[PDB]
Design a protein around this ligand. Structure first.
Ligand SMILES: *[C@@H]1O[C@H](CO)[C@@H](O[C@@H]2O[C@H](CO)[C@@H](O[C@@H]3O[C@H](CO[C@H]4O[C@H](CO)[C@@H](O)[C@H](O)[C@@H]4O)[C@@H](O)[C@H](O[C@@H]4O[C@H](CO)[C@@H](O)[C@H](O)[C@@H]4O)[C@@H]3O)[C@H](O)[C@H]2NC(C)=O)[C@H](O)[C@H]1NC(C)=O
Lengths: 672, 668
């Protein structure tokens, strides 16, 4: 009951090579294969490992100067850095074949900044079409310092310096135990000291490792600085998925807020104090992460120039809308087409497609980068290779900061302002003639917390001796949200014999007040649970769909220990290779309440139009003509949403066992 | 459904006369008794109707000048108005006997500002020892303009102008119905258009008519501007009563917050914007009530002077705290005693007692009065008699404004700072030698909403013809919170045999965190449910105690129409008589969840010391020399609250039927 895929022996060899660069990423083992291979890799004499001569020579130019030194923090949001990671990726991506890529990576694993190496390496593995099917470690196993609060990281460093536990009893009381000769450290989510306000209610979501990893995978599947020509016809839809990704994520987040009684995502101004502070429980080699207080004044001497830029970046968009048709980055933008939809997203992300070039150029300033800089609260960088980090400097920690959700809310509002220019769906575009949903039934929907382990060994240091055998076994254990399986049953009268699409969303039923949401105001608050095609036949029939089969959710990634165990059996975990960029399903449902929190499930059935065969960047691109998020991709006329083939069903989400995650990490106490 | 008291014939004659002044408060019936008696009343030639000659002549000087004109808004927070209300109260109170009192009242009811009359008349009935036992209409029946949202008031006004329903079925859809030839108007609590924020989650408590009446009652039972010497031995505890009242209230209010996901009462600063606005649906037929927007700057030009005042009034207090001991207002005060608690309360209320005088004087400025003027947001009064009203201008609307709880939270905190001077209770002062609570059991505690009617006839005008028949029958229907009765059973093992005091408190179990509250930071958050004396037996016994019997909660007021019918039978309602100044039962519990919301029940048993034989200003004054709120009148060391004669029980408060009151008011 963990999805398997069989896999042959040539595969095992290549997968083992790729996985091996992730062992002890923070130090160098002189007797690892990678070290020998890098010693033996003559880079000057290797023009013929590369499909692209320019990339090679471009790398050598920067190479001869020198790169970002080992041990410094890496972030693509600083330019000098970005130009280097991009050079590294071009090398990885234009390597003739696998041998070539492996020597290049070994070299980089040895001689280059570990952050930069891991960033380029992940992206290249996802992007190279000969590596497309290989599995990667979960990002929290590759960069545990981005996923572990200081408290836990310190406890582990402490256990290491002592070479183990003084005595068991002392240790157990501090949440430190041995299991099968490995160390396990119980971890709480952070308290009122890092989230000095109500946002702490939600720390179990915002600090969730799955949810942070998801954002990282999203970025690495199509990074802003890269064009999307690798993906064919998807190029003309890149901006669409940008909106969708953020609209869905914020919809997921607002639902968490509702169950924890927290109301709307706050709005703000660049010219005003921002309310919800955040003190990141992280440090880099030199600096504690930058802290932002409650009521932090965004508008100060240090951010004035940035704020001017941000301000006119948004107001330009207003000017576009005001005008309908306008000259923008080559063509005339007409707001009534869908070349408009694409433009809108590329505009807000300042991605490579906006400029219709291959890679983001050195002088093109991004809206999102400057926003993160203002909101990150950090002091200005010490030099081009040394910045003071904040949660917003990385996709791995971004979702920990309340400001992150506020910033994307603002962008999503802006896009929704443009979406006011889109013609709404008519009766005839949504009516499925000859078919009616007569009823929807759902099993009990139940959430709970349960423990979850990962190996954090990459954040622990090891002697020359211990390294000779790839040492690990430093596990973090944490209560994480989860739900039970449940089945949706859909009942249908049908005249016709066609293939059909069934979509299901979850959205709010009541606002923070107690009033029924009205669709005109709530369509942006629905997130997709599922999509699939079904043969329908006339009469009454019924489709059953288990939550374990929902399209947009995955199983927890396996740890590397387990990946290797499986490899020795010719086995690969499906969800880790066929769909890493997908939301973990443990977070499928907001945390419920013991009585049951009211949400609603929208079930929509429409005719299926045979759409060709692609191989797009994400799981969110289903083989359909339909816009992403359809029929909730755009403003609603409510009288058109009483279609026989639509059905809004009230459902309560329960919760069972302890309502608070800390109750799982108390020494002489066991929960429920 | 209500407790009755048999009542003799003399009483009924007097009670009827009293209640008759509360009929059609807003116009005059040329054919009613009160009118003829008022006309026959030579105020000039009847000095001998009064105990106090000074009071008599004082009123006359004033009356020769002139009083607040009829129809204008009356508020005791404005100097000249207060001085006039006090003069009229002096008259009522010093009336030789009930006859002179009636005449004066008839006289006042005819020639005077009706609001000013009602204010003075209420208080007089409560204070005069020959009226001590008589009953009063609930505040919402006497001043329904202060308990009705504008939409409802207008629905009634237009029905009157129409002389009834044109068409039953349009009317129905607007929540207007005929019942026994009386009109019933259904009323919603106000929407985000009234509280443009989170505080609207709670409108069902803050707008609640019981809760607002309760506050009006607490004021009238002992007004800040008056002396407390009428209650003798109680005078030494007036400040203690003042603290306890607000502490309890805020504790109750915070519990409603917690069940609606709301957290701590925000703190504020006179020199910064106040986050939470208030827009009242009330008007004085002249000005609408002043609105306070969100993020309203307190420190603007028109408030410079008042903020200066409020600022030193506070800082003077800090200086007290810093100095430990000092002379103030005659006295030498040492913050280690209880002559201290009393002083501290009196200080904060600037009441008459703080000056050792009979009535507040013209020029002794009140912190609460200016706090309320600044927070109330109104432009400055136009003249002596004409201000722009705010919710904080009246005891009967105060509880409706978020700022009200913020203001009293501030005062109560300053008192808690003082309380750190008080020496904590020790093991020996709390331990009951030879007695132990072995268990506490509680019935299911269930809240719910159900309908409640009152007569709003007082804000409707009638013709000469109609008036001849003193007319009513304009009823408002509203969902109100409520709970099902429940029993607490306490199990006690004891060695010997004495009378015991049993006390029950309700506190939160967790903060907005989800984290257990510790007693150190929670003692202020317990509200008292009950107090009673018990004969304890040797060995094992069980005390059973029902909610319907809880000492600090009352049944609902009956409307006058019902009071009249009871009087016709020789009966009155006990609670309106014996305990009007007590909180209503239905509000005993905060709204629960279907779920069941986690709180704790604190059960205390201590030895009974037969003491005081008194004459009570409030029912909060129980015949015990212990402090009010004992053992939660002061900072706690959590390790002394483990005596066998204490039990903390987790209870869960459930809720049944509809969670939102508006679903109770939907048409077809
Ligand atoms: C206290 O507060 C509550 C809540 O605000 C309020 O209840 C609301 O009352 C209104 C009418 O008084 C009610 O709407 C009526 O609604 C019904 C129900 O409609 C339902 O079905 C529709 C499809 O058939 C669907 O589209 C709706 O969303 C809903 O589920 C409806 O039959 C009425 O239709 C209209 O009639 C009016 C006549 O004036 C015409 O103008 C119009 O052309 C329609 O024919 C009408 O809309 C509403 O649903 C209630 N709100 C909620 C949130 O439940 C109470 O009235 C208020 N009570 C008092 C005494 O103040």
């Amino acid at each position: 009951e963990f999805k398997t895929t069989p896999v042959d022996a040539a595969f095992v060899e290549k997968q083992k090579k790729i996985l091996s660069l992730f062992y002890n990423v923070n130090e160098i083992s002189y007797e690892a294969e990678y070290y020998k291979v890098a010693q033996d890799f003559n880079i000057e004499a290797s023009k013929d490992c590369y499909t692209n001569m320019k990339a090679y020579e471009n790398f050598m130019m920067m190479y001869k100067v020198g790169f970002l030194p080992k041990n410094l923090e890496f972030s693509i949001f600083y330019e000098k850095m970005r130009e280097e990671a991009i050079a590294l990726f071009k090398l990885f991506y234009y390597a003739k074949d696998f041998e070539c890529f492996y020597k290049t990576a070994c070299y980089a694993r040895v001689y280059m900044n570990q952050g930069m190496f891991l960033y380029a390496y992940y992206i290249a593995i996802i992007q190279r079409s000969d590596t497309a099917s290989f599995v990667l470690p979960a990002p929290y196993e590759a960069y545990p310092q981005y996923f572990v609060n200081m408290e836990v990281k310190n406890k582990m460093d402490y256990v290491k310096m002592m070479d183990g536990c003084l005595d068991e009893k002392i240790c157990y009381n501090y949440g430190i135990i041995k299991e099968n000769e490995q160390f396990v450290m119980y971890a709480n989510y952070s308290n009122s000291l890092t989230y000095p306000n109500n946002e702490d209610r939600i720390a179990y979501l915002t600090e969730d490792v799955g949810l942070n990893a998801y954002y990282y995978y999203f970025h690495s599947h199509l990074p802003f600085w890269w064009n999307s020509g690798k993906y064919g016809a998807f190029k003309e839809r890149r901006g669409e998925i940008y909106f969708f990704f953020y609209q869905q994520l914020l919809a997921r987040y607002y639902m968490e807020r509702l169950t924890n009684g927290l109301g709307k995502i706050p709005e703000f101004s660049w010219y005003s104090p921002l309310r919800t502070g955040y003190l990141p429980p992280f440090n880099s080699f030199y600096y504690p992460f930058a802290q932002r207080s409650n009521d932090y004044e965004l508008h100060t001497e240090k951010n004035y120039e940035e704020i001017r830029f941000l301000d006119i970046y948004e107001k330009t968009f207003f000017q576009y809308l005001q005008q309908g048709h306008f000259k923008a980055f080559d063509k005339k933008i007409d707001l009534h087409s869908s070349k408009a939809v694409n433009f809108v997203g590329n505009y807000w992300q300042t991605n490579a497609d906006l400029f219709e070039e291959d890679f983001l150029q050195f002088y093109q300033r991004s809206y999102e980068v400057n926003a993160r800089r203002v909101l990150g609260a950090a002091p200005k960088p010490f030099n081009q290779y040394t910045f003071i980090p904040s949660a917003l400097d990385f996709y791995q920690t971004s979702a920990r900061d309340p400001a992150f959700y506020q910033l994307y809310k603002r962008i999503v509002q802006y896009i929704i302002e443009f979406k006011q220019y889109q013609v709404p769906y008519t009766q005839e575009a949504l009516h499925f003639v000859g078919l009616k949903i007569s009823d929807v039934k759902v099993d009990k929907m139940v959430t709970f917390f349960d423990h979850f382990d990962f190996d954090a060994f990459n954040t622990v240091y090891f002697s020359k001796e211990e390294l000779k055998s790839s040492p690990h076994g430093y596990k973090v254990r944490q209560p994480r949200l989860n739900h039970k399986p449940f089945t949706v049953t859909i009942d249908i009268k049908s005249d016709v014999a066609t293939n059909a699409v069934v979509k299901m969303f979850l959205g709010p039923k009541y606002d923070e007040n107690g009033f029924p949401f009205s669709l005109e105001d709530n369509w942006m608050n629905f997130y997709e649970l599922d999509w699939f095609v079904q043969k329908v036949n006339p009469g009454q029939s019924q489709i059953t769909r288990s939550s374990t089969d929902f399209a947009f959710f995955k199983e927890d990634s396996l740890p590397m220990a387990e990946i290797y165990k499986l490899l020795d059996q010719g086995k690969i975990p499906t969800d880790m290779f066929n769909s890493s960029d997908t939301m973990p399903s443990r977070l499928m449902l907001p945390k419920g309440t013991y009585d049951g929190f009211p949400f609603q499930l929208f079930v929509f059935v429409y005719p299926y139009e045979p759409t060709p065969k692609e191989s797009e960047p994400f799981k969110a691109v289903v083989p359909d003509n339909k816009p992403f998020g359809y029929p909730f991709d755009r403003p609603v006329l409510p009288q058109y949403f009483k279609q026989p083939n639509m059905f809004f069903k009230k459902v309560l989400v329960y919760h069972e066992g302890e309502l608070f995650p800390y109750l799982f990490n108390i020494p002489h106490y066991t929960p429920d």
